[model samples]
Target: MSNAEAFYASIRTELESIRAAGLFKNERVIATPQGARVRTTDGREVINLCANNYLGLSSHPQVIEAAHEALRTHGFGLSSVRFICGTQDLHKTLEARLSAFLGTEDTILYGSAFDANGGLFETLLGAEDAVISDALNHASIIDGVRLSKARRYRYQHNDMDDLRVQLEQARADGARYTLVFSDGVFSMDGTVARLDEMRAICDEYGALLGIDECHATGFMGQRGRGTHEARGVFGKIDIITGTLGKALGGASGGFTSARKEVVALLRQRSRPYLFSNTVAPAIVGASIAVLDILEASTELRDRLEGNTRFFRAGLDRLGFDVKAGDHPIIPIMVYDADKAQQLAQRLLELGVYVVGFFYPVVPKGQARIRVQMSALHDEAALQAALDAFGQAGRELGLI
Candidate 1:
């Protein structure tokens, strides 16, 4: 056989190996509108638990209308980057509203949080700088740090002592600028960052602190600002990166909020912002509406909080090991990867949908079905999910 044929066959072999390794992923097509319920490809109605539509805003009538209106008014797209000709009134309005809601001087939009992180590092730091990261931060943050020219130091996950030690090293290295990056709420465990502790350490070391609030923005704080506000360091952090893809509106876009001058600098220099297309008009409009809703009341956040507590207590009552945390990204632990996968598959079959996260997602032994709570989940649906977990555990001999 030819060399090219062998190499191409290796690609198929690698994919097959991944499938055998319990890490193969797939997508479910939803034909109906998103809500507390969803329609699967076979026209089956399922309790929608796998998505990040935390507040059920994706199919909200007013939000939908706003999107439609924007499409009509702003047209489909600019066919160019923001700095070129993508500027629109809706984009400016959304940016302003996002900044105002998050208590930042300005906000810069990106196509997604992935791109925001992808472009942020190379723009902000050079070879002499340093980026301090948490060992358990999200994949995007880790990749962001990897893309930077700056040196990298990782602290133990949520370990304040290790953070201070890293800070000492940065100082000893004579770094011009130090950036500490963390996930506001970890998606896998819902473990929140200790913003109070992080603030104290960053302040002591003269470091700029950044938080990726992708998992905590819409429902984590009194004002729905994020982990920084929830941890009582709202204005202390230097940069805040968040997504409209989750709780904001179940749309695709992200933003980085910061002081005015820093935001201006990023808009001018950040590769993602400078070259990539600005957010779509519909997402921008929906995000603007989402901010208004969150700013006006705590209805959605309260519902999500109560739902998380309810589910956590129910799981604990069933004698399952659940990671305790304030946010809705709860993990019910299973030690075996196959067991977790089987449980999740059974859960989906039982009309409950949750993601099986193991090995590569968490540590090798910490397999879990990560269940996220949303305000739209009724008491009945939530209870059914908990009961299904108990049954799945029994069936899988995991109880």
Candidate 2:
């Protein structure tokens, strides 16, 4: 056999082992546009409960039209990164608008939130600085920390005392600059970070505070500013990173919002922003449209709030043990991995489209079916999903 054949054989063996461990992931083919309902590859219509399209603007006509107009005006793509003949008036306008909406002095766009986070730390901090992070931050933030030369300390998830301890330790270590980082909302559990308390701790320690608002932007606060605004600490955050791919029209792009100096430094140094292709004009235009919508009214965000409450209450009424919190993301816990998978399959058969989360994505024995609510999911549709879950639960002897 050729030498490369053995390498491929070993990879196959690993794949088999993963399947045996019940950790293999299979993708379900989605056939329709993302909204309250979707079609599957097998021609079945399913009530979608697993999308991140929180505001239900994933396929909004106005946003789509804006994208089309931009394509006509700017062509398909720039074929160059931002610094190299890719910057357009639309791009600069969006950045300025995002800074205003997010309450930052300035903003810079990146290809994705993952890329934004990945390129963040090394550009701002060095070995002389230190980063204190939450243990349960998103993978992007974890990877960003790994790329930086800063000394790292992780506190327990949302544990204030632990954060204080780390802050003190960083000071004791003689680090010149320190940053405390966390997600504004924890995606899996739907828990909002205690930003008020965190900001207080940061103020006490003189550590700069940064937040990943990927899960909080466009639908968390009173005006959907984010968790910072919800907690009454909006302008206190030192840096904010968010995505346009979730609630902000559900297209694709990300931004880093901060003081003008910080944003200026990133434009000069962040590798992802400096080297990656510019965000398409279509996505940029769509994002601008989304911001305008949010600015004009809080109706969509309010609808999402009511929808989430209704769904959470419905789950509770059905005697389902859903993880607690008020975010659109609600996880129904099932202790066994196989049982969670089975329940998800049964729910799909019953016309609900939610996925099961098991080992790796979640802790072993902590498997769950995460249901995300959206503004487009009306009363009757929400009732139907709850009914489906109720039937599936009874059929599985879970109730």
Candidate 3:
């Protein structure tokens, strides 16, 4: 401490405390493009069960070809923002495609889903408004709400009773308008928000509903529209923010889909949209291609669903206490943080790559290995993962 700079010393001590507490997150180096399997910096090939590439279009041939075409036509990107010279015809095309796919009146693109959420609340809300948010909503949404002058109330995660209480309190507080915010799919446990019930509550309370669909945008329904579609409440969501970085080509881009007026307002006022450079041409073109594929058929999303079911069932047969859910994310419960970390490392040694989720990422005593399914993982890849999990479990005396 005496030799270190005053600013650096305290930060170093905090980091040391994190390491000692087993809460430090260390980044792994991948040597290949994202897929079901990737090479590590240490020259090992492992089954990747931790990516958000739900439909596995990250390296699809058609997506690649579309990017090349966009490079040739749009020539990379513009240095300006949308209202300036950056809003290309390609950008408009992608936005329209997103609007159609999400069944919304209009859509606006952003550099990332984080930015979309970061710039959303402040644009549509004011001091007179109230935002009743889900306790487990994404951090991006939390930050967005913080930026707004709107009154805030966070209900318990997926608890309709608490939401109703919060709504009644907001009205008691004399808010001019109220909005309920939730994630379409809670990413950690793969719990789909009870949108149908939430919608009913909103109707009873005269409040609007907004969903962040980053995890459910290109899957989770019969036609794969989103959670609202899956929950049988399509066209009811007032605002939808999602990403092109996941199932929609697994590239990089995001969008906010809402009523035409809401979108028009964001286009005019959202700081991220007005200040940040436009999403690159290649991503825009590739996302358009991804939407075309999804529109043409539900094959990719269907395959992803099937893969999720298969892998989850395999974990069950191996005697792992897996979280039950219809969605793709599967969590194998390991109550101890150190034990979860140990099993994750052991499984990786056996060639299965999955991440252990522990506090403060999740509730204490709720630590688990979170496995994400991808359409690209075939029979062999899934079986290998199951075998690896079983072996590691037995070795760790966890089964």
Candidate 4:
């Protein structure tokens, strides 16, 4: 075979190995809007417990109307980056709104949270600087840190003592401008960062603190500000990176909210912001509407909190090995990879839609079904999901 054909054949073999290991990801086509219940392309209606639709505003009428209005007024696409004719009034409005909501001095938009993180550390840190990160931080953060020239140190995940040791080591090594970064809520286990403790430690060590708040942005705190607020460190973080794609209107866009200087510098130097196309106008408008809704009331988040409580209790009652947390992202441990996949399949067949998370996504022998709760999921929907889970668990011998 030619070299090109030989390369293609090797790629095919790799794919076959993935499938053989039951680690291939299959995308399920949705025929309806994202919500508590959705119709799949195969014509089955299932309770969706695996989406990041925390506040259920993805299909909210007000958000949709705002998107339509923006499309009509601002047009479909920018066709330019922010500095060159892409800075619409809506963009500025959304930025201001985000800053106000997040309790930050300013905010800068990005294409996605991935890009927000991808461009952050490289723009801020240098060879003399140090970046201390949690071991379990998102892939975006990992890649972003790799791009920076800073001296890197990783602390054991959520271990405050280890974090202190890393910070002390960096200081001892004569590092300048050390930054301690962590996820506001670790997505896989739904464990919240101890930002209150982290803030105190950063202060003691003269280090800045940053948090990726993508999973906790819309409905974490009482007023839905973020995990910082939830952890009683409101307005204390040096930087926050979050997404509009998850709970905030569930569209697509990201922002880095920080002091004015940080945002100003990112605008000038952040590669993703400089090189990527501007976030579409519709997403901006819809996100603004979402912020307005969140600011107006805490009803949605309150409902989500209650739903999470109910579901977590039910899972525990059913004797599932669930991770302990109040966060909407709950991990029902299946331990074995093949069993996790089998359990997910059985649950899907029983009218509940969730995906199994295994190695590479999580640690080995820690496979789980990560169920995400939404405010739109009423009691009945949650109960139905629980019933399906109970049945599937019994059949798979998981519980």
lDDT of each: 0.86, 0.92, 0.92, 0.94
Model 4 compared with the native: what TM-score? 0.99
Per-residue accuracy of model 3 over 312-339 as CA lDDT, tens digit each: 8888888998887878989889988988
The alpha-carbon RMSD values of the candidates against the true structure, listed in the order shown, are: 1.3, 1.0, 1.4, 0.9
Query: Candidate 3: where is the Cα deviation over 4 Å?
Result: 1-4
Model 1 alpha-carbon drift over 4 Å, by segment: none
On residues 1-399, what C-alpha lDDT tens digit does candidate 2 reach at each position?
A: 998999999999999999998878888888888888999789999999999999988988888889899999988898899998989999999999999898999999999999999999999999999999989999999999899999999999889999999999999999899999999999878889999999999999888999999998999899999999999998889999989989997778999999999999999999999889999998998888989999999999999999999999999999999998899999999878988989999998999989788887788889899899999989899999999999999988888
TM-score of each: 0.97, 0.98, 0.98, 0.99
Top candidate when judged by lDDT against the true structure: 4
| TM-score between model 2 and native | 0.98
TM-score computed on alpha carbons, candidate 1: 0.97
Tell how far residue 372 is off in model 1, in angstroms: 0.6
Ranking by TM-score: 4, 2, 3, 1
Clash-forming residue pairs, model 3: none
True-vs-predicted CA distance for residue 110, candidate 2, Å: 0.2
Worst 10-residue lDDT window, candidate 1:
54-63
Candidate 4: Cα lDDT at 53: 91
lDDT by residue (100-185, candidate 4, tens digit) is 99999999999999999999999999999999999999999999999999899999999999999999999999998999999999
Q: What shift in Å separates residue 108 of candidate 1 from its native position after superposition?
A: 0.6
